[PDB]
Design an enzyme around this catalytic site. Structure first.
Site, PDB file in Angstrom:
ATOM      1  N   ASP A  50      29.953 -41.203  16.110  1.00  0.00           N
ATOM      2  CA  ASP A  50      29.292 -41.958  14.827  1.00  0.00           C
ATOM      3  C   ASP A  50      29.264 -43.211  15.037  1.00  0.00           C
ATOM      4  O   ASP A  50      29.040 -43.865  16.070  1.00  0.00           O
ATOM      5  CB  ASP A  50      29.549 -41.063  13.244  1.00  0.00           C
ATOM      6  CG  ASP A  50      28.940 -40.019  13.194  1.00  0.00           C
ATOM      7  OD1 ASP A  50      27.748 -40.127  13.070  1.00  0.00           O
ATOM      8  OD2 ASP A  50      29.684 -38.806  12.930  1.00  0.00           O
TER       9      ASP A  50
ATOM     10  N   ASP B  68      25.613 -33.651   6.975  1.00  0.00           N
ATOM     11  CA  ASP B  68      25.716 -34.709   8.028  1.00  0.00           C
ATOM     12  C   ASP B  68      25.772 -36.103   7.265  1.00  0.00           C
ATOM     13  O   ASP B  68      24.934 -36.922   7.546  1.00  0.00           O
ATOM     14  CB  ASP B  68      24.529 -34.463   9.146  1.00  0.00           C
ATOM     15  CG  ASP B  68      25.364 -35.687  10.329  1.00  0.00           C
ATOM     16  OD1 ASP B  68      26.353 -36.168  10.448  1.00  0.00           O
ATOM     17  OD2 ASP B  68      24.247 -35.859  11.127  1.00  0.00           O
TER      18      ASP B  68
ATOM     19  N   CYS C 216      30.952 -46.935  -2.571  1.00  0.00           N
ATOM     20  CA  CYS C 216      31.235 -45.409  -2.905  1.00  0.00           C
ATOM     21  C   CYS C 216      30.214 -44.713  -3.336  1.00  0.00           C
ATOM     22  O   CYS C 216      29.938 -43.582  -2.658  1.00  0.00           O
ATOM     23  CB  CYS C 216      32.278 -45.676  -4.279  1.00  0.00           C
ATOM     24  SG  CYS C 216      32.608 -44.007  -4.787  1.00  0.00           S
TER      25      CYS C 216
ATOM     26  N   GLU D  34      16.518 -42.562  20.757  1.00  0.00           N
ATOM     27  CA  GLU D  34      15.745 -41.245  20.231  1.00  0.00           C
ATOM     28  C   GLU D  34      14.419 -41.151  21.231  1.00  0.00           C
ATOM     29  O   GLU D  34      14.102 -41.921  21.857  1.00  0.00           O
ATOM     30  CB  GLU D  34      15.006 -41.484  18.754  1.00  0.00           C
ATOM     31  CG  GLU D  34      16.326 -41.276  17.926  1.00  0.00           C
ATOM     32  CD  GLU D  34      16.891 -39.934  17.713  1.00  0.00           C
ATOM     33  OE1 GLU D  34      16.363 -38.914  17.405  1.00  0.00           O
ATOM     34  OE2 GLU D  34      18.237 -39.946  18.162  1.00  0.00           O
TER      35      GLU D  34
ATOM     36  N   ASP E  16      29.962 -37.213  20.229  1.00  0.00           N
ATOM     37  CA  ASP E  16      29.397 -38.190  18.946  1.00  0.00           C
ATOM     38  C   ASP E  16      30.464 -38.564  18.154  1.00  0.00           C
ATOM     39  O   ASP E  16      31.107 -37.952  17.523  1.00  0.00           O
ATOM     40  CB  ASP E  16      28.681 -37.226  18.193  1.00  0.00           C
ATOM     41  CG  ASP E  16      27.642 -37.998  16.969  1.00  0.00           C
ATOM     42  OD1 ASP E  16      27.945 -39.086  16.764  1.00  0.00           O
ATOM     43  OD2 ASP E  16      26.811 -37.418  16.504  1.00  0.00           O
TER      44      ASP E  16
ATOM     45  N   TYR F 179      27.863 -31.279  25.105  1.00  0.00           N
ATOM     46  CA  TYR F 179      27.778 -32.182  24.128  1.00  0.00           C
ATOM     47  C   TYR F 179      28.473 -31.607  22.728  1.00  0.00           C
ATOM     48  O   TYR F 179      28.224 -30.674  22.553  1.00  0.00           O
ATOM     49  CB  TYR F 179      26.538 -32.646  23.711  1.00  0.00           C
ATOM     50  CG  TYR F 179      26.031 -33.379  22.636  1.00  0.00           C
ATOM     51  CD1 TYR F 179      26.736 -34.751  22.968  1.00  0.00           C
ATOM     52  CD2 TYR F 179      25.420 -32.906  21.580  1.00  0.00           C
ATOM     53  CE1 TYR F 179      26.338 -35.613  21.654  1.00  0.00           C
ATOM     54  CE2 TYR F 179      25.033 -34.019  20.584  1.00  0.00           C
ATOM     55  CZ  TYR F 179      25.686 -35.101  20.518  1.00  0.00           C
ATOM     56  OH  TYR F 179      25.255 -36.180  19.663  1.00  0.00           O
TER      57      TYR F 179
ATOM     58  N   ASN G  41      16.905 -38.036  23.442  1.00  0.00           N
ATOM     59  CA  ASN G  41      17.486 -37.272  22.617  1.00  0.00           C
ATOM     60  C   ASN G  41      16.345 -36.168  22.130  1.00  0.00           C
ATOM     61  O   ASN G  41      15.439 -36.496  21.603  1.00  0.00           O
ATOM     62  CB  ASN G  41      18.110 -37.694  21.422  1.00  0.00           C
ATOM     63  CG  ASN G  41      18.721 -36.718  20.365  1.00  0.00           C
ATOM     64  OD1 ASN G  41      18.875 -35.608  20.830  1.00  0.00           O
ATOM     65  ND2 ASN G  41      19.128 -37.045  19.146  1.00  0.00           N
TER      66      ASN G  41
ATOM     67  N   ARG H 295      24.462 -46.007  21.236  1.00  0.00           N
ATOM     68  CA  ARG H 295      23.391 -45.459  20.729  1.00  0.00           C
ATOM     69  C   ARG H 295      22.433 -46.371  19.522  1.00  0.00           C
ATOM     70  O   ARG H 295      23.119 -47.019  18.643  1.00  0.00           O
ATOM     71  CB  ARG H 295      23.768 -43.814  19.821  1.00  0.00           C
ATOM     72  CG  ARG H 295      22.305 -43.586  19.133  1.00  0.00           C
ATOM     73  CD  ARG H 295      23.094 -41.986  18.558  1.00  0.00           C
ATOM     74  NE  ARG H 295      21.869 -41.651  17.796  1.00  0.00           N
ATOM     75  CZ  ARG H 295      21.853 -40.297  17.282  1.00  0.00           C
ATOM     76  NH1 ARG H 295      22.949 -39.510  16.848  1.00  0.00           N
ATOM     77  NH2 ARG H 295      20.694 -39.955  16.528  1.00  0.00           N
TER      78      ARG H 295
ATOM     79  N   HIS I 266      29.584 -41.498  22.265  1.00  0.00           N
ATOM     80  CA  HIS I 266      28.294 -42.239  21.835  1.00  0.00           C
ATOM     81  C   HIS I 266      28.595 -42.775  20.435  1.00  0.00           C
ATOM     82  O   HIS I 266      29.100 -42.144  19.531  1.00  0.00           O
ATOM     83  CB  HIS I 266      26.918 -41.907  22.049  1.00  0.00           C
ATOM     84  CG  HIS I 266      26.473 -40.453  21.161  1.00  0.00           C
ATOM     85  ND1 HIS I 266      26.234 -40.794  19.758  1.00  0.00           N
ATOM     86  CD2 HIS I 266      26.291 -39.323  21.371  1.00  0.00           C
ATOM     87  CE1 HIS I 266      26.017 -39.604  19.175  1.00  0.00           C
ATOM     88  NE2 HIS I 266      26.009 -38.880  20.112  1.00  0.00           N
TER      89      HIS I 266
ATOM     90  N   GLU J 175      27.190 -45.508  17.394  1.00  0.00           N
ATOM     91  CA  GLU J 175      25.588 -45.866  16.813  1.00  0.00           C
ATOM     92  C   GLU J 175      25.596 -47.236  16.194  1.00  0.00           C
ATOM     93  O   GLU J 175      26.737 -47.646  15.541  1.00  0.00           O
ATOM     94  CB  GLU J 175      24.808 -44.817  16.300  1.00  0.00           C
ATOM     95  CG  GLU J 175      25.242 -44.224  14.912  1.00  0.00           C
ATOM     96  CD  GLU J 175      24.620 -42.828  14.533  1.00  0.00           C
ATOM     97  OE1 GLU J 175      24.952 -41.693  15.522  1.00  0.00           O
ATOM     98  OE2 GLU J 175      23.717 -42.801  13.916  1.00  0.00           O
TER      99      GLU J 175
HETATM  100  C1  LIG Z   1      21.977 -35.939  17.821  1.00  0.00           C
HETATM  101  C2  LIG Z   1      22.479 -36.061  16.272  1.00  0.00           C
HETATM  102  O1  LIG Z   1      22.741 -37.482  15.908  1.00  0.00           O
HETATM  103  C3  LIG Z   1      23.702 -35.376  15.988  1.00  0.00           C
HETATM  104  O2  LIG Z   1      24.311 -35.711  14.844  1.00  0.00           O
HETATM  105  O3  LIG Z   1      24.103 -34.200  16.796  1.00  0.00           O
HETATM  106  C4  LIG Z   1      21.283 -35.715  15.592  1.00  0.00           C
HETATM  107  C5  LIG Z   1      20.497 -34.835  16.376  1.00  0.00           C
HETATM  108  C6  LIG Z   1      19.727 -33.607  15.424  1.00  0.00           C
HETATM  109  O4  LIG Z   1      20.202 -32.801  14.977  1.00  0.00           O
HETATM  110  O5  LIG Z   1      18.337 -33.795  15.236  1.00  0.00           O
HETATM  111  C7  LIG Z   1      20.373 -36.966  15.182  1.00  0.00           C
HETATM  112  O6  LIG Z   1      20.968 -37.776  14.214  1.00  0.00           O
HETATM  113  O7  LIG Z   1      19.172 -37.236  15.725  1.00  0.00           O
HETATM  114 CL   LIG Z   2      22.309 -32.292   7.447  1.00  0.00          CL
HETATM  115 MG   LIG Z   3      25.372 -37.432  15.023  1.00  0.00          MG
END
Ligand SMILES: C[C@](O)(C(=O)O)[C@H](CC(=O)O)C(=O)O
Ligand SMILES: [Cl-]
Ligand SMILES: [Mg+2]
Ligand SMILES: C[C@](O)(C(=O)O)[C@H](CC(=O)O)C(=O)O
Ligand SMILES: C[C@](O)(C(=O)O)[C@H](CC(=O)O)C(=O)O
Ligand SMILES: C[C@](O)(C(=O)O)[C@H](CC(=O)O)C(=O)O
Ligand SMILES: [Cl-]
Ligand SMILES: [Cl-]
Ligand SMILES: [Cl-]
Ligand SMILES: [Cl-]
Ligand SMILES: [Cl-]
Ligand SMILES: [Cl-]
Ligand SMILES: [Cl-]
Ligand SMILES: [Cl-]
Ligand SMILES: [Cl-]
Ligand SMILES: [Cl-]
Ligand SMILES: [Cl-]
Ligand SMILES: [Cl-]
Ligand SMILES: [Cl-]
Ligand SMILES: [Cl-]
Ligand SMILES: [Cl-]
Ligand SMILES: [Mg+2]
Ligand SMILES: [Mg+2]
Ligand SMILES: [Mg+2]
Lengths: 286, 286, 286, 286
Positions: D87, D58, D122, D186, D85, D44, D208, D156, D112, D114
């Site tokens: 997004d 993130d 912005c 989740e 991923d 993954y 997850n 997702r 995946h 979401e």
């Molecule tokens: C799976 C996940 O979406 C990710 O960005 O890897 C995360 C997992 C995590 O690091 O907790 C998430 O948004 O749950």
């Molecule tokens: Cl983060």
């Molecule tokens: Mg992610």
């Protein structure tokens, strides 16, 4: 001079030195070398050019990386100041910040960011919609927050076609207040609207000389005499290149040989001169 | 279900002979496809020169791979890629083949020059010995899929004469090369003996401003040639057209005189298949 | 105003001695910065190995450049980059230096192995002659800025003995190298004579599982060393930790036993400086 | 078997073969090799991992290219099926289409996507907002339109935390109707909600198993016994790697040497085994 100037400083100086500065689109590093040879003092990386050269329509599919990679290839080959189209900044405040920093790291001199809507729905149709002034202000502030002093942010407004001259000036002025260094507007349908435009916004103004749109072609001198500091030729070279390529392809297909095309080809010799080929192959040899 | 390599083999078998045209970028590849070519080419000299570099083996696997990926993203037309001498030893060659396959490339050519190679049409090339080229070929064949096409290119003609060249080519076929690239043969009457000796399909390089006269595809086919390459033809015309537009804008202050030499927006929209985009949105989001 | 190279030179001058720690990626560089190191390192073996490749000179300028750019985007901490033998001839070396400078890299090291290099700690290295390394250095010095640091690395010790090594190092300084990387010296008592002879700052490579005993920074400084490199230290621990987590999950069906060995979300947030992001939005968009 | 299976087919088969399939996060190609060595059947590429490894939070700053480049490096090194991923798809329908095609070209097995909001204003703050079912349906249709049959689209949903179990099931079911191949949810706070969830959606369900969130850790067996077909360990290895790196950095800083860290380092020998180093260095030598 003997200072070794930052790219942005070179751009600002090119704008100040010329009347006006003509900035020509180049799709790749070789085209930028051709422009430099002819004597232009600034060059341009068109967003539509980046997309179209990938075989994609100019629909905001490309990202920071598509443009950044084309920009890096150009600035590696020339110190001629490059203006780069970054569309609406590729996402929110942090993406805009990343775009500015990466463009600066790529030795780019200037970017323009525009006030079109970006983040439409998934299956949302193509169109010409503007964000509100406030939203563009936010985009500009995101950019200004991280840029170096010398680096040039040009705020581009597409308001003219949609909202008229007065609304456009209001936006442009608000954009300058938010910290834009210069203003990018479409070719005004009336050359005599330029003095009013340029006097109101104060900062240098770019006029976009696109072909085959709704905007007329004035000369650089005419535009400069009306207050304009930059004139952009975004796709001109590229449209001629495509016709030439197509013609060569058809020639080879029709005739089984490219003889008829020969007069329309740059020679190996001229190519070697532009590349400085001889000061490699000969210059340094075992 | 039909691999890139298979499409290439089939194009070679079907055409008499297969014309393969250089395209420097994805848009040029779309132009060639529109005209109806059955295979396209990514020139190593084109990769270098488009970056503003001489064709002196400065570029690496990544420079070429990135240009190849952009083209194959835009078209399924089988692409032949110039990988020079393989960019290093056995392991680099293996990496090159696997990366080229991953990029959906149909065929590569690798040559028998020493590392710091030049244009095959330039004077003063150094060749590796037959054994060393055999090793290069073996490195490649060891990791390639069956359908994927390895073309072994020999530059031996100018340096060693026709006889030595044919012997190398034959050894290269024995080592597992699928096809042969017979570089810079100076006379149409070199081909029959070359092609008969090597057996596998032979490519003739119809490049301009070189050591070869420009023969027709029919003439070349009548002498036993299966592929004719036009490596930089389109690119040379594009450069002259770009330069002419740049000179126009510089001299006249406006691009009016250039307009007749530009592809129209309409033709550009057709080549990008812009309407299929609007169509798709209507298809899916209605 | 203060260039990467200048920051590096100043770190070397200020510290007694300067510890330079390997970081494979930008997050590792942030961890090192947090701990308070003054310079960081991008290992060539790390570049290769992280891609799943052996350290056999398969990687090119692009593999290394891309890892370097990702690190310098995240930190101004001066970065030393391994560029192996320069990735080809003079022109490739020149390209490497200019690209490294464009990537905001502070320093590079280039070595005197033949093209298809190995780990300096491995048996059976082949060296180029002094003259050839001189040429490599000259290619680099010709295009570098003054502040940018070229470290010449010699692998000669294992092959030629201490005396020959010092002679090479001295010749390399004469050719314009700024600093010296004295690879795989086996005994602390090799350093004083080495360092006194070459004059310019010397780096000692404190890599694990090699030919060197692990001496302290103080010991090395007391023997005339100005820089100590820890090239893969962090990376080796990371791999063992990853493997242990993977085994845990495989064996136990869940990662519970691994939890005590994981960095907390809180610490991760601090190293990313996550709160400065929320802060910035409040600063600008309020 | 002897078919030579597409990546997606390998993924589908891994899901069918295991009870359940454990999929472990790997931040780079080397970590994927470690997982393969331990015996996992799928790997993954975490979006948060891609961002965080760049030193970015993130927050949707990264684009298709950031993820694509990390994915390519992994699939180059292993045929173990990779789930990536992507997004919210990085933009509208055409960007989603590009993402699918590029992921397929990179030999990725599964992605995946979401149902979070993407294209916020912005200066728009971080948060956990969902798009309406219809909008996610559109995103899925954009993806399904261009994917190959074997390639796996996992939809997702982040609806659970926000909307509860019932609303989540409704979305998931609608997503399956739109053409999603599998469902990513989740970790349900109650293992005994899984049978209802899995029976309602029909298609394979991923659970997850993140650490240090709001979700508990059940075993793979427990989850499988309740209907779950995939269990994801997205960041586990990476959190342990960071702690280990930090500890090495602190060791070197505190002690002036890394001796105390040695027991926590993977050995050169084990590294060589994972890379197959000896079947290069020795295997093929002059
Ligand atoms: C799976 C996940 O979406 C990710 O960005 O890897 C995360 C997992 C995590 O690091 O907790 C998430 O948004 O749950
Ligand atoms: Cl983060
Ligand atoms: Mg992610
Ligand atoms: C400048 C421009 O924004 C571009 O993408 O290059 C175009 C110019 C053109 O090709 O007409 C535009 O949107 O006007
Ligand atoms: C075909 C070629 O290999 C190329 O890289 O384009 C060149 C073409 C040229 O230089 O005109 C060649 O070496 O023949
Ligand atoms: C420093 C080094 O050049 C590296 O690439 O990391 C290596 C380190 C090692 O192999 O442990 C070296 O050649 O010494
Ligand atoms: Cl368009
Ligand atoms: Cl330059
Ligand atoms: Cl850069
Ligand atoms: Cl004002
Ligand atoms: Cl050339
Ligand atoms: Cl396609
Ligand atoms: Cl054969
Ligand atoms: Cl389409
Ligand atoms: Cl190794
Ligand atoms: Cl920074
Ligand atoms: Cl010096
Ligand atoms: Cl910040
Ligand atoms: Cl593999
Ligand atoms: Cl790819
Ligand atoms: Cl269902
Ligand atoms: Mg644009
Ligand atoms: Mg070539
Ligand atoms: Mg190294």
């Amino acid at each position: 001079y003997f200072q070794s100037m930052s790219p942005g400083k070179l751009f600002r100086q090119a704008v100040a030195n010329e009347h006006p500065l003509q900035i020509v689109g180049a799709i790749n590093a070789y085209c930028a070398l051709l422009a430099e040879n002819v004597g232009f003092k600034a060059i341009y990386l068109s967003g539509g050019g980046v997309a179209n050269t990938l075989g994609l329509p100019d629909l905001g599919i490309t990202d920071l990386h598509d443009v950044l990679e084309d920009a890096r290839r150009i600035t590696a080959a020339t110190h001629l100041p490059l203006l780069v189209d970054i569309d609406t900044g590729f996402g929110g405040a942090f993406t805009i910040a990343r775009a500015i920093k990466e463009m600066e790291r790529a030795q780019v001199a200037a970017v323009h960011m525009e006030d079109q809507v970006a983040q439409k729905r998934c299956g949302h149709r193509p169109g010409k919609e503007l964000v509100n002034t406030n939203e563009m202000v936010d985009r500009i502030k995101a950019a200004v927050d991280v840029k170096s002093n010398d680096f040039v942010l040009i705020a581009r407004t597409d308001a003219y076609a949609v909202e008229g001259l007065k609304a456009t000036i209001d936006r442009a002025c608000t954009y300058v207040e938010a910290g834009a260094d210069m203003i990018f507007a479409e070719a005004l349908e009336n050359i005599n609207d330029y003095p009013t435009f340029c006097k109101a916004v104060k900062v240098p103004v770019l006029a976009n000389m696109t072909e085959f749109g709704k905007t007329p072609l004035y000369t650089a001198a005419q535009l400069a005499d009306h207050g304009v500091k930059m004139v952009l030729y975004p796709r001109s070279a590229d449209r001629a290149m495509s016709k030439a390529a197509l013609a060569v392809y058809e020639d080879i297909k029709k005739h089984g040989v490219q003889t008829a095309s020969l007069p329309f080809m740059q020679t190996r010799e001229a190519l070697y001169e532009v590349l400085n080929y001889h000061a490699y192959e000969d210059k340094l040899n075992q």
